[PDB]
Amino acid sequence: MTVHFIGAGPGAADLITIRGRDLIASCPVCLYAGSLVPEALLAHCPPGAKIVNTAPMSLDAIIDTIAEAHAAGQDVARLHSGDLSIWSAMGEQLRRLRALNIPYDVTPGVPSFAAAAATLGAELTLPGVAQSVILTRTAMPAGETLENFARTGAVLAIHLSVHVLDEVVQKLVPHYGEDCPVAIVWRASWPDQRVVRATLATLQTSLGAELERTALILVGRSLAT
Template identity: 60%
Template sequence: MTVHFIGAGPGAADLITVRGQRLLADSPVCLYAGSLVPTELLSVCPPGARLIDTARLTLDEIIAEMVTAHSAGQDVARLHSGDPSVFSAVAEQMRRLDLAGVPYAVVPGVPAFAAAAASLGRELTVPEVAQTVILTRTAERATAMPPGEDLATLGASRATMILHLAVQRIDAVVADLLPSYGPQCPVAVVARASRPDELIVRGTLADIAERVKAAGVRRTAVIVVGAALTAAQFPDSHLYSAGRCRS
């Protein structure tokens, strides 16, 4: 028996991986976050599968379901939105499963920031413009940020910055990033990336807060900040240069 932590993708049901879909179809127990995982994915589950919405369950209750399935010799598909490697609360589940002696495996998924970049039609790393991507969040209504990971400190690099779980604090985000990035730095907010009701709000640090409020974006959004969003004048990558290909 194995608990499969499966990245369900950013929202579109067809963005789950082939491996993830296969495991989902083979697991008699499925735990999913009803508020984030597309319900269309549940149709892949085998007939008679036990489907458990974890949206209102505590960590202890979630682990208890996994341990019960383990005792019955049943594989578990644990669906997480996006990719399990970032902001998924998988680490504490793994820690509890280790203590309980329950085996698990991880299946990666398409992260929300990748879906947002696809919707924006932009590469986040552009030659001589931006070669670093920072994935972060803010601390309101969540665990505290570690020392040195506040936005003002991270922003000093002027790297492409992706903020999850932060759109409700857009004013504070702007205030923290303005000193390093400047008011004309491009910003895009992608709400519900890849879903039918996806919404994109574009602007700069000078006006993005008001644009986001006017659009009514309050949750399930990714904030992208950095010059890569609008870069047009930059050298071609060395990857396909004539000198490299002929050497």
């Protein structure tokens, strides 16, 4: 047996990869990270599959469940939302699996910044304007500061609490300017999707009625309309 870590993508069931879909279809055990993974993907699980919601489970119980599948020789479709390379929390699971010598592989998914850019119809890189993209969130490691990032002029993709938005704006404005385009996306790709396009000066006044805490913000001239 093998544990197959799978990037489920941003939310829409048709934005999983073909490989990921095939793997869900052929595993008798499926461990999935709660309602961030659309239940429509669970329809691909073969009959016979036991389906396990890891979201309210502890790290220890997740590993015990994988261990009992491993003892039974049963493959696992381990679904995380988005892509596995960023903010999946796959690493701590991998470290626990290497300590038990349970085999695993990784199938990449669509990251939410890509899904966000697609909904906006935007190429983030624009010759002359920006050729780089920085992915980050708001204890951050030593040199990982908004100012350090803002100095580059790169397109920024920041995962954040709406509660700290005011600080984010203050730190970016000296670098990018009052009038710099920014776009906020909530629940990218879900039926529920909301998209606000604004400027740094006008972002806070352009959040209307939307009460959700976490969002993704994209900042740069290449986000102009």
